[PDB]
Ligand SMILES: Nc1ncnc2c1ncn2[C@@H]1O[C@H](COP(=O)(O)OP(=O)(O)O)[C@@H](O)[C@H]1O
Ligand SMILES: CC(C)[C@]12C[C@](O)(c3ccccc3CN1)N(C1CC1)C2=O
Ligand SMILES: [Mg+2]
């Protein structure tokens with residue numbers, strides 16, 4: 001159906017490991033969108049065909065305002081093209097670099113939107129497994145949108161930076177929905193502080209800090225945020241709260257600008 005000739009390509013939006021993402025306009029409708037370009041040789045050498053199929057399959061059937069739409073795909077002799085919803089306000093990653101850290105209200109609002117999207121996913125027993133700032137995008141009204149479903153699967157299951165991964169996943173053990181709850185805790189901390197809680201200089205040390213759950217709070221982190229973050233970052237996945245508990249947490253309801 002679709003081919004390259006149906007699109008006018010514009011400025012580069014961002015780069016990933018495989019993805020090279022461009023602004024584009026569909027010629028006949030003038031529909032503005034983002035084109036994620038992937039190199040077949042690279043996908044082949046890495047052997048990640050199965051991940052790309054999951055990305056296309058999962059994300060094209062999901063329908064939630066806080067989840068980035070994927071409309072379709074095509075391919076030519078050297079490349080694959082994913083047709084995505086364009087997110088005009090950029091990444092949460094960029095916004096964090098701009099401001100250093102977020103206040104409590106901005107943080108709590110992002111966490112609610114995230115918890116809302118993750119709740120929809122887990123209801124279908126879909127787990128994302130790669131929640132982090134560069135994969136969280138912003139809409140025209142500044143609303144958060146989860147993207148990059150390359151690592152997602154159907155729980156239960158086995159299998160760059162370790163910073164967002166829970167102990168059971170890094171230790172090669174088995175995992176479920178609770179992995180996304182650990183990542184949610186890591187994100188809440190990084191939003192308020194400016195860096196992720198287990199960050200270190202080497203892969204080897206980061207691994208040690210994650211598996212031992214070694215993190216501390218700066219003085220300016222309030223009691224409420226401390227309580228929520230400490231509940232999310234439990235070694236034992238079953239001890240981690242449910243998304244409903246997160247959305248009803250006193251610190252969240254006191255500071256968030258959006259509902260569940
Ligand atoms: N729909 C989009 N709108 C705006 N920017 C995007 C969009 N998709 C991706 N980007 C930018 O391109 C980067 C890489 O995209 P991503 O799909 O995460 O690739 P990868 O799977 O290689 O990580 C993102 O971090 C973001 O900066
Ligand atoms: C025609 C065929 C060879 C294929 C199928 C493929 O696995 C795939 C997977 C998800 C989405 C699109 C496509 C494109 N067509 N693949 C990419 C190299 C991974 C191809 O080149
Ligand atoms: Mg990505």
Ligand SMILES: [Mg+2]
Pocket residue numbers: 148149150151
């Ligand atoms: Mg990916």
